[PDB]
Amino acid sequence: MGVFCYEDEATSVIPPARLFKSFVLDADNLIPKVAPQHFTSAENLEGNGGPGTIKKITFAEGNEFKYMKHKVEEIDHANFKYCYSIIEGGPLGHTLEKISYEIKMAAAPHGGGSILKITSKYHTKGNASINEEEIKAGKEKAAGLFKAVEAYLLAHPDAYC
Predict the structure, then answer these.
(1) Which residues fall within 8 angstroms of residue 13, CB to CB, at 6 or more apart?
(2) Is the separation of the CB atoms in 51 and 73 below 8 Å?
(3) Of the candidates 45, 24, 65, which has an alpha carbon nearest to the alpha carbon of residue 149?
(4) Rounded to an integer, what distance in angstroms lies between the CA atom of residue 60 and that of residue 68?
(5) Which residues, at least 6 apart from 86, have a Cβ–Cβ distance to it below 8 Å?
(6) What does residue 79 show for φ and ψ, rounded to 5 degrees?
(7) Residue 38, Cβ neighbours under 10 Å: how many?
(8) Residue 106 parent element (H or E)
(9) Alpha-carbon distance 154 to 157, whole Å?
(10) Greatest CA span in the chain, whole angstroms?
(11) Which helix (H) or strand (E) element contains residue 134?
(12) What burial letters (b/e) apply to 113-133, b meaning 16+ CB within 10 Å?
């Protein structure tokens, strides 16, 4: 193998159909809608925003090339599963050949509660090991993004697609 796989668990009462189309499908649309910072900008290097799409985000503008690059592993709205992979990001990591993050959604049997799961994959040279704490920090950042998207739904929980 040589790759560490971690899974995150999140329980919340949210609609999987609207949440996925509003959080996963409208993820690139809700990000800008919030208008959190105007000093950063995202650009799609290739792809229409689906599986194999290449997106790059840079904090500074005016650069022909972006130091940070984002690549999507695969997007399947039918299975409510999303795969996100990262090629390079600032320091990226030590002995970390690559870092990918996947977001999956599922509906509970009660019929009134959806659970979100996230998976991460880190390619290590081989003699290098990743600590759960080091990767845990990355999870905290992802959780923050969820709070932002959740805040929007809280302001308009009756929104309809």
Answers:
(1) 112, 113, 114
(2) yes
(3) 24
(4) 11
(5) 69, 70, 71, 92, 98, 99, 100, 101
(6) -90, 5
(7) 8
(8) strand 96-107
(9) 5
(10) 51
(11) helix 132-155
(12) ebbbebbbbbbbeeeeebeee
Please, what are the domains in the chain? 1-161 (3.30.530.20)
What one-letter code names the amino acid at 4?
A: F
What does the H/E/C string look like for 19-59? HHHHHHCCHHHHHHHHCCCCCCEEEEEECCCCCCCEEEEEC
Residue 145 to residue 124: CA distance in whole angstroms: 26
Strand partners, 44: 55
Name the residue type at position 129: S
Distance CA 18, CA 113 (A): 13
Which structure tokens are listed for 69?
């690059």
The label of the residue with tokens 């290098």 reads 128
Record the tokens describing residue 155, joined without a space.
């302001």
For 81, the 3-state DSSP assignment is strand
